[PDB]
């Protein structure tokens, strides 16, 4: 809470190596002002992708909500930073999270008429859907479920096939 203020300011400004320095010297990667804004928020809002990667690598909370219920992903979607969005999604940002305006990163993408962003977001949603869909197989055991889950997280782009397999097995193990 002193090195932290300089971290917020260096993230806002866009000064890379200054941040790598601040980090190496052990500054709190999850510091916030009176509006619950963390350095990841500032670096997402202001379009600095390198600094996002650094902060993320140092373990910044990727689903941090500020005073308006807004997440780094929301703030990245507000300006159309495709590059940032993608890595934010790799570190496990919740694409369906809502804020005080009832906005989803998707809804925002629809506001700005951004179709590329929209298809990134959209294709991300099907995968979480596959997860939740696998979870509601009533004729599986915890071993099968977990196996399918771990297989999913090892390779998200296989989601659909994985789901297929699950259903096949599900109706194969139908009771009595």
UniProtKB/Swiss-Prot annotation:
Repeat positions for Immunoglobulin-binding region D: 125-176
Positions of transmembrane segments: none
Practical applications according to UniProt: Important immunodiagnostic reagent because of its ability to bind the Fab and Fc fragments of a wide range of mammalian immunoglobulins.
Domain of life: Bacteria
Subcellular location(s) per record: Secreted, Cell wall
Function: Plays a role in the inhibition of the host innate and adaptive immune responses. Possesses five immunoglobulin-binding domains that capture both the fragment crystallizable region (Fc region) and the Fab region (part of Ig that identifies antigen) of immunoglobulins. In turn, Staphylococcus aureus is protected from phagocytic killing via inhibition of Ig Fc region. In addition, the host elicited B-cell response is prevented due to a decrease of antibody-secreting cell proliferation that enter the bone marrow, thereby decreasing long-term antibody production.
Domains as described in the record: Each of the immunoglobulin-binding region repeats can bind the Fc region of an immunoglobulin.
Entry's family note: Belongs to the immunoglobulin-binding protein SpA family.
Subunit-level organization: Interacts with host TNFRSF1A; this interaction leads to the stimulation of both surface expression and shedding of TNFRSF1A.
Name of the protein in its database record: Immunoglobulin G-binding protein A
Gene from which this protein is expressed: spa
Residues of the full protein shown: 102 to 153 of 508
